[PDB]
């Protein structure tokens, strides 16, 4: 079948996934040690990140990352085995929701829920 979850829009770095303020401090010490660093993101002090497409980015992020059902219908997994970093979820037929020509929206039947996402988490 074709209903399964897919993903876009995440960001990465070369450290250990420190999170928050500490990641920014660690990056500044690392910047002082060696002048090489990656690129800007988009947000409203400052730090730098690697832009990588979708599914591949999520896989690296999950490995970096490492109530049982801490997860929520958002697609946000938090940190487990906070920051301004990107994280995301989309269902298979999602495009209708933002697609211009014939508008409409994803159905209640089509939507993810908690449970399918929980199966996906167990799957990896």
């Amino acid at each position: 079948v074709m209903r399964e979850i897919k993903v876009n829009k995440l960001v990465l770095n070369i450290c250990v996934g420190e999170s928050g303020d500490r990641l920014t401090r660690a990056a500044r010490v690392l910047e002082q040690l060696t002048e090489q660093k990656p690129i800007f993101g988009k947000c409203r002090k400052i730090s730098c990140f690697v832009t990588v497409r979708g599914k591949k980015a999520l896989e690296i992020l999950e490995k970096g990352l490492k109530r049982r059902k801490n997860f929520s219908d958002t697609g946000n997994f938090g940190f487990g085995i906070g920051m301004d970093f990107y994280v995301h979820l989309s269902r298979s037929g999602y495009r209708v929701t933002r697609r211009t020509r014939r508008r409409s929206k994803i159905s209640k039947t089509h939507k993810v829920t908690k449970e399918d996402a929980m199966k996906w988490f167990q799957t990896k």
Partner: protein, 252 residues
């Protein structure tokens, strides 16, 4: 609160059906329609261009009091009759579709020359208009290529040059209407990988049409185009409700 409730429903208005679909914004429509009251009876022809995921559809429409009257039509899967079997959204296909619809309209009118009042050396000469048609009016957008084809066809429409490459490049525009840009991508992709080329342009291979052949097939097509003219009642529902009541008494 629940928010979605009887009061919310009573207050609500969803307005126009086409607006619910996402077609026909009305804001464009009124301006396309509108004309001076002493210039009455005269019709502002719209050259309707709608972008399907399968094909582009080109119609000549005039808006009237019981709904729009459609004068002329071309859709990309008519191009089959002119020998084109693939690439139905393509820039060249959109050009040709517009050109055919214009040429057929002129044939229907009679007289291949568009205007009486033309200058002596190098309807009206250009009086028909755009239909914006929901798709976003960027450079390289589909409507402008179809309109350019219609102009070259015979009908003619007001135009800038702002949505062609170099915003202009006439040679690149010429390549795009010929089909060279597809051809260059096909050869380049084939050069990089044969499996990606084959899997991508699978229909072109089945047809046995190479990149080379595209410019000729469109050119031949242009000359050929130029030449050629249930619901259930209450009584049943009541009976069903009674039966279901009995069934629930049995079931539990």
């Amino acid at each position: 609160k629940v928010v979605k409730n009887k009061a919310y429903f009573k207050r609500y208005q969803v307005k126009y059906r086409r607006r619910r679909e996402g077609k026909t914004d009305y804001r464009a429509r009124k301006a396309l329609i509108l004309q001076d009251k002493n210039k009455y009876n005269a019709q502002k022809l719209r050259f309707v261009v709608r972008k399907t995921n399968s094909q582009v559809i080109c119609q000549i429409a005039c808006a009237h009091i019981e709904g729009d009257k459609i004068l002329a039509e071309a859709k990309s899967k008519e191009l089959i009759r002119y020998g084109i079997p693939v690439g139905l959204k393509n820039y060249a296909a959109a050009y040709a579709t517009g050109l055919l619809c214009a040429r057929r309209f002129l044939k229907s009118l009679n007289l291949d020359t568009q205007f009486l009042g033309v200058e002596k050396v190098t309807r009206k000469p250009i009086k028909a208009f755009l239909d914006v048609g929901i798709t976003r009016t960027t450079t390289g957008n589909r409507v402008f290529a179809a309109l350019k084809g219609a102009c070259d066809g015979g009908l003619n429409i007001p135009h800038g040059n702002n949505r062609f490459p170099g915003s202009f490049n006439p040679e690149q525009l010429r390549k795009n209407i010929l089909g060279i840009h597809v051809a260059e991508y096909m050869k380049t992709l084939q050069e990089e990988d044969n499996d990606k080329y084959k899997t991508h342009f699978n229909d072109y291979l089945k047809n046995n049409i190479g990149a080379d052949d595209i410019e000729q097939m469109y050119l031949n097509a242009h000359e050929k185009i130029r030449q050629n003219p249930k619901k259930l009642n209450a009584k049943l529902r009541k009976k069903r409700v009674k039966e279901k009541l009995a069934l629930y008494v049995e079931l539990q």
